[PDB]
Structure formats: C-alpha cells, structure tokens
Amino acid sequence: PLSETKCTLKSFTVEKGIYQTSNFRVQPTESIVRFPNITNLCPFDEVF
Amino acid sequence: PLSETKCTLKSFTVEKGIYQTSNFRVQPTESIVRFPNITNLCPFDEVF
Amino acid sequence: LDITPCSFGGVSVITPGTNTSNQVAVLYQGVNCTEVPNVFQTRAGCLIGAEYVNNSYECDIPIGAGICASYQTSQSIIAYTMSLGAENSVAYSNNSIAIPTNFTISVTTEILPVSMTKTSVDCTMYICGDSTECSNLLLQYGSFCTQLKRALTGIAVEQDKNT
Amino acid sequence: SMTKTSVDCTMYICGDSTECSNLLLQYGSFCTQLKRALTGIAVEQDKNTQEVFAQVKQIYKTPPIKYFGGFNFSQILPDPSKPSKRSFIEDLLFNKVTKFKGLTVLPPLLTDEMIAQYTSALLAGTITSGWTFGAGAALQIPFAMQMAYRFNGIGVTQNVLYENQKLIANQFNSAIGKIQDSLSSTASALGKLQDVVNHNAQALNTLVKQLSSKFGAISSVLNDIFSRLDPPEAEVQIDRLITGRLQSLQTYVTQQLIRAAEIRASANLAATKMSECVLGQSKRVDFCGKGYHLMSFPQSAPHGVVFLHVTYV
Amino acid sequence: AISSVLNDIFSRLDPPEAEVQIDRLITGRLQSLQTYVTQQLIRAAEIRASANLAATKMSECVLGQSKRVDFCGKGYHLMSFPQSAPHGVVFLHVTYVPAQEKNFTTAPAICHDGKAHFPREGVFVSNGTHWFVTQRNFYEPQIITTDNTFVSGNCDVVIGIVNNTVYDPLQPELDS
C-alpha cells in the first residue's frame, strides 16, 4: 500500500498525510443459472 | 393548477409559496401557403 | 429474495513520509473487518495496521469520527481519539479576583494570499496542434473560446486590481 | 459546515461492467480531477469546524455553585446526569433538524460530543472569565464585575446594574425560557440550517435519477447495450452514456464548489462572531444583535451554530 | 477516438470519416478547458475575499489600532508590520498577552458614610490588609480617593459592599 500511494499520485516520494488509492470490492465466485419448472407441458405424445 | 404543482415538484403535498409549473403559448390555427404570381410566363403556345 | 450488493468501500493509506519510515495502515472505509477477508474497528471503518491505545495525544493525520493517528515509538503507527487540549478549570466565588502582574510581547505571523499567476489560453494553438484542417471546423462551434478569452482577461485585470 | 461526500468513477459510471472501465481510460483523468476537488472540500469543512469551534484549546469547566447573581445558566449548560452531553436548548436543536451507486458520506473529524465539549468550554469561560480567556490565559473575574465592563462599552454607567439586580436577572431568565418555548413549537425558526441539509439531499437524488436517463442512447442499462448489439456499433452508445454521466458528475462538483464558497463566507462570518460576540464586547452596530450588544452564548447545531445574542433595547 | 494526434486523423482517414473523430478531439479539449476556467473563476472568488480581508487588515491593523479581538492577532492589538511576499502579504502582528497573575479579593463598592462609592476607572482590589484600585490588565495599586471614585446611592441597595473609608484630599489641606 505504500507503492499504491506512488501509483496514484505519480511521484516517487510520499509526504506525511492521508491518501486514497483505490477501492475494495468482493469479486463474484459462482453464477446462479435459473429457469422455470417442468410444469405447463405440451402434448407431444399425441403425434409421437 | 393545484395538481399542476404536484407533478413538477414530485410531491403529493404542496406548501405555502409561489411555484412555476409550465409555460403558456398560443397555438397556431391556420397555415398561410403563398406562391409568386402568374407573370413572367413562357410561350408554350408556340408548339402547342 | 432480498438483493443486496456485496461489501465495498474506499481504501485509504495512512503512512508517514518516506524519509522517516515505510509502515502503512490500511483503512477500509465503510467496511467492517468481519467481511474483509493489529486491528481496530472505528465508526468510519475497521482499521488494519495500527495499535489502538487508551491515552490521547496531539496527532497529525486525521482518520474520521474522532479517531486520529500519528507515528510514535521499536516504532509503529498508533491510533487514538483526538485530544481536545489539556483540562484546566478556573475557580469562582463571589468576592475574589485575579489581577495580572506581568505581561509578554509576542509577534504572531499571519499569512494571507492576495494574487495568483495570470494565464492566457488561445483557441488556435491549444485545440489545434498547428493544424489547418482543425481551424475550419473550429469556426462552426460559434464563440466558445472568445468567452473564455474574456474570462481569462477578466481574471487578469482583477489581479493587478487586487494589488 | 456541510455534508462530506465522495464518489468514485468505478461504481457510479460503470454498473459492474468490465468494458466500461476499459473505455474510461481512453478519456484520461476526468474522474481523477473531481476526486481531488472532493477531498479539497472534505478537508475544508473539517477546517471550518476548527476555525469556529476550536478557538482556544484549554478546556474549562463550570463550578458546582450555580449562583451568578440570580442568573439561571442551567439551560445553556450541558447536563452531566444525561449520557449525552447536550444542553436543554440543544436537546431541541438536534431534534428539529432531521445508496449503492458509489455515493458515500464521510463522517467529520469533530464529533457531536467533541463539538459540545468545545462549546461548553467556551461557555464556561464566558461566565467565569468573560473577555480575558480569548486573549491569553484565563483570569478569575466575578459575574458582577463582568457586567460592569460590558455596560461601560456602550456608555452605560454601573448604577443601573446593582440597583436593579433583581430586575435584570428576572428579565434574562424569562427570555431564556421564551427561547425554549419558541424553538419547541416553531420548527421553521431553524430554516437557515434546513437549506444546508436539503440542498445536499436534493443533489444526491438527482445523481441517481440521471442514471435512468439515456442521454441520447436507446437504453440506460449497460448490460443491454453490450449483450444485444454488435460491439463496434454498441460502443458509440457507450460514449453517449459515459459523456452524459460525466457531465452530470461535472455538474455536481461545480455546484458544490460555489456552495463551498458560500459556506466559507458564512463560517468566516461565524468565526468573526465567535471572536467578537463571544470572546469580547463588539462595538459595532447591528452585528452581534439589533442594538447595543452586551454578551453572547453560542450553542451547538447540526452543520452550524446557534447564537443567543442579548440586546440592550 | 482512435488517436490523439490531429495530423494522424486527417492524413489516414477519409475527410467524411476523419471529421467525426476530429470533433471528439474538439469537444474533448474544450470540455477540459471549460472545467479549467470554472475552477479558475471559483479560485478567483476566494482569492478576492482573502485580498479583501487583507485590505481590511491593511486598513485597520496597519493604518491604525483596531479594537477587534482575534482579527489583528491573538490578544490586544497594538501595531502591525506588513512584509512583502510572492502572491500575498505576510503580516507581523504585535499583540498584548498577560503572562503572570495573582489572586486577590474584591468588592463592587465602598460604604464610607452611608453612601456607596463606585470606582470610576479600575476595579477595587485588596491584598488582605488594605483596599486599592488597579486596572484589569495590569497590577498598579492606588489609594482610594474622591477623584478616583464617584458617589451613587446608599449602601442598602447594592450587593457585596464592605465598610471602608475614602481618603478625601481636601481635609488635610486646610491645616497645611
């Protein structure tokens, strides 16, 4: 995080003070794929 | 006009004061279609 | 199902100068440190990398909501509440008085800025990098930069007026 | 002071989109320069609290004998029996004055307990020392001698003070109780604090409702442009949306900066009134109250101060 | 756009196709100039109000003695000496601050012969033995005379009065 202050301020010397560099965010791990159920079917057995 | 103040303020309760709602303008009714006159004609009767 | 976005917030770095030391203190602002993955929880956010103490001294680097920080002593970054000064009350009665018997004459400096650097930006060279095809469509935008030339002259006529 | 806000260009502009942050680097550093101005007004309001409240660093305290010549100062002083260090007027001052798009609200440096500890230290120095604790070390001056000098600043001799000591202190304690009856009933008396919090609230919801607009695009949803359209024909709709969201973000930083210029002129007027009406006797006419000014008692307020100016009429 | 150099846009693309990349460089550079001059004019307003505060400090602290508190320095203002600086004025404010104090006893009036004697200049102080007159910012005890006091009413209406005599200077001058 000392080098993160140099990466944002574009300087190789950091003075005494409070500096904001970036933001933390939790990355998504899984992916929920949903669909409706097996109700409301079609009578395909009448021709097949 | 009391309900006109509710739509521009996004609130169902209007307090005491002077408020501007919209703008008034007289709408047009007719349309004047103009063309130049029938002078400077060309001799079409010389072949017709 | 209740849709809530997952935990996010700003990251700030509390550090002294590079000529003094190199230790940092990561502040997850708005983020509790039970949801992040030698630690202290504040109102602005849980602080990672600072030793919290009970005494309060004169600090230099503020954090937020009363919590402040400084670099003290085998040295690390500590964090404490902001001290409001030394408590020294004055007694009171109905028949006593306190008269000064001596004084001191001090000189206290006060610095107030008056003027600044007068600049002037032209429309032909800043927008067009010595380009001739750029200037023909510069006339199609009307009079944007003519008003910016009047504003920059109106600033620069106030700077010698302020002197 | 005002409300400290901070917004990022990662979450407000891009609604969890990886292609939006890649086109943000082509525009340069538009969101970097407004980030430097938003921390410039964040440390300015923290300096405005130190310029008004933190005039002296020595914390004073009241004596337990609350007898100042028949003067009832229990209403403007904070109650030590309460867990919150607030006054009887200040319990009504904090009562009358009352998300996920990257917008955050930073807490200030001085809290409400630290402001009222600075307020009660300036209030205890007013009744026990008067005008001497704002000019160096505090001296022990009685309350009968403090009204002799403050009458002498407006050309009033001290003979009306001691011959009418019961009539002056009954007029002050009835007027202090008339403040608490008017502040508990009339909620529109604190409207100078109310437009500070309402203009900051109406600036925040217009940042949210401008994201629903399209700015000339066919949709305001960043997922609907990228998933449905062809990617060289979709990217001209991103540049319409990233320009309209930046211009509303460039609108919000410019209206807050002139509001920062308006809140700097009032806090410099407040720090003048903290040094002239509280720390001494002002010889101006209609500055610390309408008429001949005697003394003042400051009170804490949400994003402001409340002055109890007494006047000689 | 595709590039930042304006010569690379015109000499590579069609003149119907390079013009739409040209106005992105025109309105992109004009918007960066517009946020510069609005930040300039906001900074021109706060540098005017500090220079008007400096002109008030040049008129009250330098050209005379201002009776304000915490305006020409912390404490009682005596004089000021301005100094030159780049883009500002640095003021050297001379102030009056008391350092050492001492506790005494006091009373608002003196009952001499049934009438109350109020102090004209200064306050009534005592060192435990006698009663003296000194000011509020410095210690300089003087004897209580009729020239330093003025009579106002009796002793029954004021609160805190003590019994002491007032030295009348005309009384030893009749036999001297």
Next chain:
Amino acid sequence: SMTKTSVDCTMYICGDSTECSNLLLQYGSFCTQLKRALTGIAVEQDKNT
C-alpha cells in the same frame, strides 16, 4: 443586486419544433436544474434588497 432572469427549457433549446421536445426527455431532468438554479437566484436578489 443584479437583473433577475429566467430561461425556458422548451423554448430556448427548441425553436417551436415538436420533434425537439420529446428528444429532451432522453436527457432526463437536466434542464430543470438550470431552471431551478436561476429561480433560486431570483429569491436572494429580493433578499438583498
């Protein structure tokens, strides 16, 4: 004080064009904010008197 002024969103941008007025709705409530800033100016010019 100064001269109190007001601007219309529909009339200044669109010179009596009906196809210009419905295309301002895609920009949202942005031109109301320039209208609400100038009406807030016209209150405090009466306060300065």
Next chain:
Amino acid sequence: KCVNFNFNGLKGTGVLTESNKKFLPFQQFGRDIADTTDAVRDPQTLEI
C-alpha cells in the same frame, strides 16, 4: 528555419537544431511530457 515536416507520416511545424541527448539505434521518434513529436531521426542520414 520554420518549415513543414514530413518524416514517414510524422508531420509538424518548427525548426531543427542539433540534439545533445543519447538515443537508441532502433528509435524512430521521441516524445515529450505532452506525448507529441519533438525529436525525429532522419531515415537516410541519422541525425536526431
């Protein structure tokens, strides 16, 4: 002399002076703090 420039597409307008810095053998052109054309090696002769 104030002349026009045409160096394999790198156009410009200015004068040409002798450079005193060290340069690379594979270098076509250099860039300043504004990231624009300021130093051009000749494609035939090699004067930076």
